[PDB]
Amino acid sequence: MSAADFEAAVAYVRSLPKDGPVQLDNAAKLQFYSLYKQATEGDVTGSQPWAVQVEARAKWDAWNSCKGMKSEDAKAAYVRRLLTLLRSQGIQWKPG
């Protein structure tokens, strides 16, 4: 598996049901969000959200923490994080 499997990894995460076999805590969701944005859009854009927008601000800050990361490195990190998260829940992943 490589950065070429990024889209399969994203599709898998998008497909996960709410209370299904894979559990994503806030940390994992923020890691996937930030690496996804870094992989697809590059460095963080725009102004920092207001703190009262807790989730929006957390997402933007997480993306900001990825600045300087090459898009292919963000793609690889996303797939690696999916594989590691699934392994921590007794699941082996393969695209498809």
C-alpha positions as a Markdown table, in Angstrom:
| # | Residue | x | y | z |
|---|---|---|---|---|
| 1 | Met | 0.0 | 0.0 | 0.0 |
| 2 | Ser | 1.1 | 3.5 | -0.8 |
| 3 | Ala | -0.2 | 7.1 | -1.3 |
| 4 | Ala | -1.9 | 5.7 | -4.4 |
| 5 | Asp | -4.4 | 4.0 | -2.0 |
| 6 | Phe | -5.3 | 7.4 | -0.4 |
| 7 | Glu | -8.6 | 7.6 | -2.2 |
| 8 | Ala | -9.6 | 4.1 | -1.2 |
| 9 | Ala | -8.7 | 4.9 | 2.4 |
| 10 | Val | -10.8 | 8.1 | 2.4 |
| 11 | Ala | -13.7 | 6.2 | 0.8 |
| 12 | Tyr | -13.5 | 3.6 | 3.5 |
| 13 | Val | -13.6 | 6.1 | 6.3 |
| 14 | Arg | -16.5 | 7.9 | 4.7 |
| 15 | Ser | -18.4 | 4.6 | 4.4 |
| 16 | Leu | -18.1 | 3.8 | 8.1 |
| 17 | Pro | -21.5 | 3.6 | 9.9 |
| 18 | Lys | -22.2 | 5.7 | 13.0 |
| 19 | Asp | -22.1 | 2.8 | 15.6 |
| 20 | Gly | -20.3 | 0.2 | 13.5 |
| 21 | Pro | -17.3 | -2.1 | 13.9 |
| 22 | Val | -14.8 | 0.8 | 13.6 |
| 23 | Gln | -14.8 | 3.5 | 16.3 |
| 24 | Leu | -13.3 | 6.9 | 15.6 |
| 25 | Asp | -12.6 | 9.2 | 18.5 |
| 26 | Asn | -12.3 | 12.9 | 18.1 |
| 27 | Ala | -8.5 | 12.6 | 17.9 |
| 28 | Ala | -8.7 | 10.2 | 15.0 |
| 29 | Lys | -11.3 | 12.3 | 13.2 |
| 30 | Leu | -9.1 | 15.4 | 13.5 |
| 31 | Gln | -6.1 | 13.5 | 12.3 |
| 32 | Phe | -7.9 | 12.2 | 9.2 |
| 33 | Tyr | -9.5 | 15.6 | 8.6 |
| 34 | Ser | -6.2 | 17.5 | 8.8 |
| 35 | Leu | -4.2 | 15.0 | 6.6 |
| 36 | Tyr | -7.1 | 14.9 | 4.1 |
| 37 | Lys | -7.0 | 18.7 | 3.7 |
| 38 | Gln | -3.3 | 18.7 | 3.6 |
| 39 | Ala | -3.3 | 16.0 | 0.9 |
| 40 | Thr | -6.0 | 17.5 | -1.2 |
| 41 | Glu | -5.6 | 21.3 | -0.8 |
| 42 | Gly | -2.1 | 21.8 | 0.6 |
| 43 | Asp | -1.3 | 24.2 | 3.4 |
| 44 | Val | -4.1 | 25.6 | 5.5 |
| 45 | Thr | -6.1 | 28.4 | 4.0 |
| 46 | Gly | -8.0 | 31.3 | 5.4 |
| 47 | Ser | -8.5 | 32.7 | 8.9 |
| 48 | Gln | -8.5 | 30.8 | 12.1 |
| 49 | Pro | -12.2 | 30.1 | 13.2 |
| 50 | Trp | -13.5 | 31.6 | 16.4 |
| 51 | Ala | -12.9 | 29.4 | 19.5 |
| 52 | Val | -16.6 | 29.2 | 20.3 |
| 53 | Gln | -16.8 | 27.3 | 17.1 |
| 54 | Val | -15.0 | 24.5 | 18.9 |
| 55 | Glu | -15.1 | 21.9 | 16.2 |
| 56 | Ala | -14.3 | 24.2 | 13.3 |
| 57 | Arg | -11.4 | 25.8 | 15.2 |
| 58 | Ala | -10.1 | 22.3 | 16.2 |
| 59 | Lys | -10.2 | 21.2 | 12.6 |
| 60 | Trp | -8.4 | 24.3 | 11.3 |
| 61 | Asp | -5.8 | 24.1 | 14.0 |
| 62 | Ala | -5.2 | 20.4 | 13.2 |
| 63 | Trp | -4.8 | 21.3 | 9.5 |
| 64 | Asn | -2.5 | 24.1 | 10.4 |
| 65 | Ser | -0.3 | 21.6 | 12.3 |
| 66 | Cys | 0.3 | 19.8 | 9.0 |
| 67 | Lys | 1.7 | 22.9 | 7.2 |
| 68 | Gly | 4.7 | 22.2 | 5.0 |
| 69 | Met | 3.8 | 18.6 | 4.5 |
| 70 | Lys | 4.0 | 17.5 | 0.9 |
| 71 | Ser | 0.6 | 16.3 | -0.4 |
| 72 | Glu | 2.0 | 12.8 | -1.2 |
| 73 | Asp | 3.4 | 12.6 | 2.4 |
| 74 | Ala | 0.0 | 13.6 | 3.8 |
| 75 | Lys | -1.7 | 10.9 | 1.6 |
| 76 | Ala | 0.8 | 8.3 | 2.9 |
| 77 | Ala | 0.2 | 9.4 | 6.5 |
| 78 | Tyr | -3.6 | 9.2 | 6.1 |
| 79 | Val | -3.4 | 5.6 | 4.8 |
| 80 | Arg | -0.8 | 4.6 | 7.5 |
| 81 | Arg | -3.1 | 6.1 | 10.2 |
| 82 | Leu | -6.0 | 4.1 | 8.9 |
| 83 | Leu | -4.0 | 0.9 | 8.9 |
| 84 | Thr | -2.8 | 1.6 | 12.4 |
| 85 | Leu | -6.2 | 2.6 | 13.8 |
| 86 | Leu | -7.8 | -0.6 | 12.3 |
| 87 | Arg | -5.0 | -2.8 | 13.7 |
| 88 | Ser | -5.7 | -1.2 | 17.1 |
| 89 | Gln | -9.3 | -2.5 | 16.8 |
| 90 | Gly | -8.4 | -6.0 | 15.5 |
| 91 | Ile | -9.1 | -5.2 | 11.9 |
| 92 | Gln | -6.8 | -5.7 | 8.9 |
| 93 | Trp | -7.5 | -3.4 | 6.0 |
| 94 | Lys | -7.0 | -3.8 | 2.3 |
| 95 | Pro | -8.5 | -1.5 | -0.4 |
| 96 | Gly | -11.9 | -3.0 | -1.5 |
